[PDB]
């Protein structure tokens, strides 16, 4: 739809909606977050994309969780993007998901070694 994240284009909306409603009514204290790379950013790609983290887990913890999965080089930085807006580190993934999840009940987060937009 938005032609930005690849997970929306590789799977139909009906399967993504029923996957979100299934994982929500099963694990209520966690949020589904799809993590994907930025357009042609100089950063390794994350083969694992579906991430189920707890709601009260903060964005700061999510930065450490994802950066370990990427095996990122120590020189680069990591910037997340929730609706092309660098999310507040002092916020929780449950509040971001509550305010930014799409119609398929999924929070989409993109990472990049450079701030595309946010600050």
């Amino acid at each position: 739809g938005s032609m930005k994240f690849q997970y929306k284009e590789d799977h139909p909306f009906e399967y993504r909606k029923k996957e979100g409603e299934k994982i929500r009514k099963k694990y209520p204290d966690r949020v589904p977050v799809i993590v994907e790379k930025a357009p042609k950013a100089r950063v390794p790609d994350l083969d694992k994309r579906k991430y189920l983290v707890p709601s009260d887990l903060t964005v700061g913890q999510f930065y450490f969780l994802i950066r370990k999965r990427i095996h990122l080089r120590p020189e680069d930085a990591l910037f997340f993007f929730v609706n092309n807006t660098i999310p507040p580190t002092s916020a929780t993934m449950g509040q971001l998901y509550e305010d930014n999840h799409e119609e398929d009940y999924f929070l989409y987060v993109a990472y990049s070694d450079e701030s595309v937009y946010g600050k």
Binding site: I23, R30, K50, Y51, L52, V53, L57, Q61
Partner: peptide, 15 residues
């Protein structure tokens, strides 16, 4: 930071 793959997912714990 606990790894956990169930039903095609990555349930990363606070540990």
């Amino acid at each position: 930071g606990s790894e956990y793959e169930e039903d095609g997912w990555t349930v990363l714990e606070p540990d």
